[PDB]
Amino acid sequence: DVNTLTRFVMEEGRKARGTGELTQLLNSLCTAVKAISSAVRKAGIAHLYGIAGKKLDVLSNDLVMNMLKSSFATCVLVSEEDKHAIIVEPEKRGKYVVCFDPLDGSSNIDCLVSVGTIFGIYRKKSTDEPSEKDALQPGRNLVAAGYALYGSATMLVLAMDCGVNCFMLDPAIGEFILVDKDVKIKKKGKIYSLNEGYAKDFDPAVTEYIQRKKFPPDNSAPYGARYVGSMVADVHRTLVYGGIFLYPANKKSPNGKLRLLYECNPMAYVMEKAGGMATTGKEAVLDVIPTDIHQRAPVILGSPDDVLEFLKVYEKHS
Amino acid sequence: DVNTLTRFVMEEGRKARGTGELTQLLNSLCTAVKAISSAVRKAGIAHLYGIAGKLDVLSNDLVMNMLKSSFATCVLVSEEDKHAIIVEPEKRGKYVVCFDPLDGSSNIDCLVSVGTIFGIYRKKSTDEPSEKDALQPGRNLVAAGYALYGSATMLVLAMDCGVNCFMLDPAIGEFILVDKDVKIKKKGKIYSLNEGYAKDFDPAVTEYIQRKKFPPDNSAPYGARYVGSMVADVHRTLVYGGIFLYPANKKSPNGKLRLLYECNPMAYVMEKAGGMATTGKEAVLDVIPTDIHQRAPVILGSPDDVLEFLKVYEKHS
Amino acid sequence: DVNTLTRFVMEEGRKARGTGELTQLLNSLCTAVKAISSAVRKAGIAHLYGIAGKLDVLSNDLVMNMLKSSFATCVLVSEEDKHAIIVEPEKRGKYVVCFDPLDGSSNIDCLVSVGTIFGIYRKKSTDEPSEKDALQPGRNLVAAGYALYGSATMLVLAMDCGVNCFMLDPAIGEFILVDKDVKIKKKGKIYSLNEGYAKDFDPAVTEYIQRKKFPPDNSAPYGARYVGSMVADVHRTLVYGGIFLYPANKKSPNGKLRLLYECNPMAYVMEKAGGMATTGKEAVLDVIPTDIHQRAPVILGSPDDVLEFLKVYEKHS
Amino acid sequence: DVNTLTRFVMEEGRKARGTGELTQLLNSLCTAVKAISSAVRKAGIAHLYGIAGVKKLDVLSNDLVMNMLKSSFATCVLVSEEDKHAIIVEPEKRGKYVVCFDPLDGSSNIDCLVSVGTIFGIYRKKSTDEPSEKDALQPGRNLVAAGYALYGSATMLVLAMDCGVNCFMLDPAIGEFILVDKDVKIKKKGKIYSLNEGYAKDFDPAVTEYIQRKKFPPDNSAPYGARYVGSMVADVHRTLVYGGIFLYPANKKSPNGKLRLLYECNPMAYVMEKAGGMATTGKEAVLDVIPTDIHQRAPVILGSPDDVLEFLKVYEKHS
Ligand SMILES: COCCc1sc(S(=O)(=O)NC(=O)Nc2cc(Br)cc(NC(N)=O)n2)cc1C
Ligand SMILES: COCCc1sc(S(=O)(=O)NC(=O)Nc2cc(Br)cc(NC(N)=O)n2)cc1C
Ligand SMILES: COCCc1sc(S(=O)(=O)NC(=O)Nc2cc(Br)cc(NC(N)=O)n2)cc1C
């Protein structure tokens, strides 16, 4: 039977017999993603170039913010684009806290590289007046998370307790079609992904691990290398093909570069629901308790055999 | 004034006072590229999954049929076809087209950027058309370019008048001129290659990449990017500057990329943009091919970066 | 605040504290409507004409499959099917849907506006659904409406809460709420019927039309419009006011339009918008059908106009 | 073999050995029609209604056609339904052609989503004097090309030239007009008549009798059907496809009709004649009227030749 994102979420909600707020939230986010996809693919660019005589990251943030505010399902919104948490006005408050990066990778969008939207959804835990503190939950508390990848096609990957499911946007009809059900990552991959241009700054553990991938001590084939430079594209390839993605700490950047709340945690959650792993080196990404909504974290994620091998090398230098 | 691909090509053809065959060819290829973009973005995928109860093959069929029906071509070389295609006599025109209809599609399962690459020659011999008419050096190209199906769809077209970039507006199905007479940066800050083959690299490549990560002059190290899809990696090189490398390795002792419909079209765009493209021993555009699917090593990009690599290459004889 | 069809229906369903079946039904229909619109605007026609080397049947297949797979329906009545379709047991829900998947398609050769019409009932039986579950008067309708594939695509949905109009934004494939709680004008200035059959008219219809062209009180004559596509003519009546007629005559004592999936949904829309819909003898919604494909005369639109017609009909006993 | 509008126009142009100006004109107009279609179908309307937290369609359509024609370098004088005076193209952008157009015909009722359309007629400038409004005052017989785009259930472009009438369907998935009906001809006699019968009190007596003959034929044959969309492009395209007759005739209140000669009547009369139909004012061929004002009106009766001839017989009976 054909299935769509909306119909899929509704069916899961009916099984759980929830109130419907989470379904309204996801439907609103789905509408925002279709509008971002349309803008990213440059619909209407002819009018900007004068056929008849707002930047993408700003527009993307406005779409997600406005669709989430008007869903009546959220109370606190944390965005990569905003210094402070946004508190939904009282008449529109619902029960969820949403952390998101509305257009990840957009710094290099001038070269038409894949870009994406990342989101993580938490339940507000206290009855206190909503505030920035409500977003300071460990990733283990996520109720749902995922990403939209605007690549050669647009796909939404949605992770929940029931697993990870992948939906392809059919732009002819504006519907997300379920195309990959209950996806699991390979136990061990053949690709490693990181910015090797910064090798002079590498932690000694990262240097040794990468050397073993290129010069295996036994007779296995060296791994292939890929680094798009857009987190959503690199993580999605890691999910589909297996392997390992690294944005690790070094001494210049002792906490890494990627943001914990709206980059690392949603991707770590997708990975764990697909049977993968996600570590800071010292602990699971999902176990870090944040103290700042924009705090950074190191991240190494992907196939479990590859992540465990990195942790072996990391321990060796600890 | 706004400009479109069709109107741009027509105006250039009128200036040159040609017969119109090349304009008909390019218009036909433009139509194929829009149809490929629609399929790559998965229009109609709901019907395949039962709402009412392969991509590289379709892409090849689109380009082949639109080029045959243009009446402008006589010999067609495709990555997808083992032999050159000889256009039937009643549809024959004067141009030879070499193309890769969906480059990078081996990894399309992860939604990586993919693209279409093409190079167009005037048939040079007066012999009956045959595979030999496609064996010209890239220096003989009349036009070349690529369509990138990335976050948006863009067509990059290089001719004697330079390199011009057109964005497909999917609301109206028109390629809009957005970047005119493009030139590559003299020196970039990104290097692009699959370092997974480090064990197989020749010493010149090894030393060069070492210089990018550990500069002797205490300058900042280069960043690394490698999409694994040639059109995406080359387009970033064009837009941002830098260097792209696919050297020979043990699996690929003559290189991996195809000379006729990957290396030559990209080298032509690079040189018309003021960049460089070398095999290490000679300019890519100067290689005389003997086989339509033959491979070549390639290093291309900003001139100062390619010149620095050639300096290291000279050092190792 | 912006609103969409899906979010609007979900909010109304949550207010009503229903089980969710009707919302799933409407979402599935909305997907079918978007797929029908795409085909009607001829997306992909280049492939039918050979770029790489039925419509009413497809429309019926889209509606049937999306409704079957919604798990919300048990009996489906379509203009396209001689007998009611009984949903297989594991996919059964509690609702009966009567629909015309592509009304007006006989003249789609001239690109006239076409549409989809639907009416939704709760089933009457407590087990063993059958065609009898579709033989309900229109008064039993829970929801009804139509999609108009006109210059743009619009979905009009009528429920107890009133009538709401949603424009399909094809750039994002979303139905946007653009007209809330619509009410028809009390009196219009347009009448709509096929005057080519004037020879067969009931004397009452003859007199009423004469009053529109030669008003007795020196008011302005009405304008005439007749698209010949019921959804287009009824939507114009809703938006502008006025009156639409497909009346009974001696050759066709029960009219031409079908009661279950043309007259009843349009009459329900009209009544929820403050209009009227009559057969001449009784309200359309009060007719108890005995056959799923039975015909009915229909006169609908602005209340002052329908009441003026009924006054003339009364005079002719 | 598949054919597109661009490939069709180029091929006809190559045969004629022209300079390419008309092809550039038609391609620019084709781009304009695609952008009008996108706007008419409401692409982007979600932004107007606040999805992220601006100009009327007839104004936008005029701006699109005007800007694309000016930038084609193929035109010198432009007449639009929307502008009181002819637009004279600035000297560095001038070409040899005169274009008359209605950028969005029928938009008065676009609130109810009725079919709308774009109508155009193309003339060669005839005099060697500085271009002016007078260059647009040519009879329709001087037309080089004319046609219309119908934004109906699908978008179709009908293009008439010396070689006949050809119909192209816009495939919105790829933004290309695909040739779907070649060298179209209208039926010799139809079964549908089309006019606003609500104004019957004001009819000319000849029109009253003709419509009387359609509903109550003297030989007891079957009556004609009636259709009137109220959008000229929709009603005329139906007349072309199904045959029959379309009337917007003169009366005493409107002795010159209501439709505009230069950018409604003449282009449609030209399409009809190239398809083997007829188009008359009652007194003369529409294409033979020599205009004196760019916005002058003309009565028009057009369609299947046998139906128009029967109208003319009734019209002659009433002198
Ligand atoms: C960790 O959560 C994952 C699972 C969940 S729970 C929710 S929900 O939004 O909280 N509840 C919800 O949609 N309920 C719903 C919707 C409709 Br329509 C009908 C009925 N019927 C009834 N209640 O009898 N119920 C969504 C998802 C995906
Ligand atoms: C290496 O070439 C780069 C430049 C060229 S040359 C050609 S072409 O196809 O050979 N000639 C061509 O389009 N002619 C053309 C087209 C049109 Br419309 C009108 C007229 N007018 C006339 N002939 O008076 N001529 C295309 C391009 C881009
Ligand atoms: C004349 O129509 C009356 C209006 C109605 S009633 C229905 S419905 O489908 O029967 N019920 C329904 O959607 N319930 C729903 C949906 C979601 Br999400 C969450 C919850 N929560 C919970 N149950 O706690 N409930 C749809 C419409 C438009």
Ligand SMILES: COCCc1sc(S(=O)(=O)NC(=O)Nc2cc(Br)cc(NC(N)=O)n2)cc1C
């Ligand atoms: C009024 O119907 C007459 C038919 C006509 S004439 C024109 S045109 O624009 O005047 N000439 C034109 O397109 N020439 C053209 C274009 C291209 Br490409 C190549 C060559 N070749 C060459 N010149 O050798 N020529 C268009 C149409 C449809």
